[PDB]
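Colleagues,

Please find the record for the two-part complex below.
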Amino acid sequence: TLERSDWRKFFSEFQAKGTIVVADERQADRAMLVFDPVRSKKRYSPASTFKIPHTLFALDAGAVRDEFQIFRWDGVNRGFAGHNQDQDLRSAMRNSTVWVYELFAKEIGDDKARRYLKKIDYGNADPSTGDYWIEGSLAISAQEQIAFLRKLYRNELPFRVEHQRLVKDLMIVEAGRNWILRAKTGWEGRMGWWVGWVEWPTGSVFFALNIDTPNRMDDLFKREAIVRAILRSIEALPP
Amino acid sequence: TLERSDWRKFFSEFQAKGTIVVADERQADRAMLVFDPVRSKKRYSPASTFKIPHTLFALDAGAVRDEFQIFRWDGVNRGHNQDQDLRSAMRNSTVWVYELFAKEIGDDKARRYLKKIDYGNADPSTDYWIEGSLAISAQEQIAFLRKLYRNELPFRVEHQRLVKDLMIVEAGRNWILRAKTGWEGRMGWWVGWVEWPTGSVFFALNIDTPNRMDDLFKREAIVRAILRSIEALPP
């Protein structure tokens, strides 16, 4: 691996404190790039980035059939336009609609959740807590997120390939003729994430960033701002 | 269906002659929008738009394992000159890769697949999808695409998802454009759909190409202009 201490300029540009791991697979046998190596190995609640493996759990357990199933909103104003309405998997993913996944968690159960977490060796694989991925015991590091994402990319997770493909499709955030950005944000109040990858004809560039959010909601834009600036600097995103 | 004769302005804007069928599912119980209904039902060689079903045939027959398998370029300069994977083959309409699949699949199996999905006239008599008797209409392309969208085709759902993935041409935070171009020489195509939170908007256009390659840009130009007019693509 290679430390990129010079990347501090990107974090300072947005007055943020955090870490980022970038694994560029476009060429062969390349070192992972990391800013703040120690923090990159520190485990934190995955927050909504957990929707990536959780969707696999839900599809595997039959808690959700496919991308067309609709889950009905209870009418409760949770203070999120994206949340205050019926949802399908894509809207739930795109808007981090936690209540939908709370439904899945209830149907899956704690015992099965533990088995699923163990089979994918996800962080501390501890679902002790309803939303164990937000306020529960579950925690994972930026480096561990990269390892997990690479397995999903390669269809190497112990789930139906159809489910792995559906989740990768749900993760689409942006795309051009020769590139596709797949990612997921996360925020649990004081910690924010943005993990995913951008695929190019010669290979994919994985990333996992987390930052503290002392300004709460006002710091959320920094997640994508920092990652995009870094990705652009290594030509992993169009200029 | 609803004939949008007023859409003639989009074709003339690009000095083109053709047809387009648009199925906007963002709305409940609606008719498809069509320019030149007669031509919309006329069958034409699918050309490279055939790569959508052909990839399913290839995956199903094991001619290709996944999106990571690499097919080595023979070094012939076809004017495609590099090793390819499914995505590069799709994006660039790399016919030789599919000629490879066709050879492994065989004529009998190809005919079986075509009849199973009742694709156009389902006739591979002869690249049968470019210079053979195989032909399909714009309306038939829409029907086929809708089945793929719904994971209703007679193939593994994982294969249908992979093909839909390979078709990605552009995307935004809440929209994804999946499409495939085709050109048989005298005419060309652009078929696919754009997905939005409230539903998907399917399209199938074909136009004549008297100016050959100089007319190719018109395929996307006309469709994009029409999609924008019904807010199916960002302004």
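The first helix of chain A runs from residue 8 to 13.

Comments are welcome before we finalize the supplementary table.
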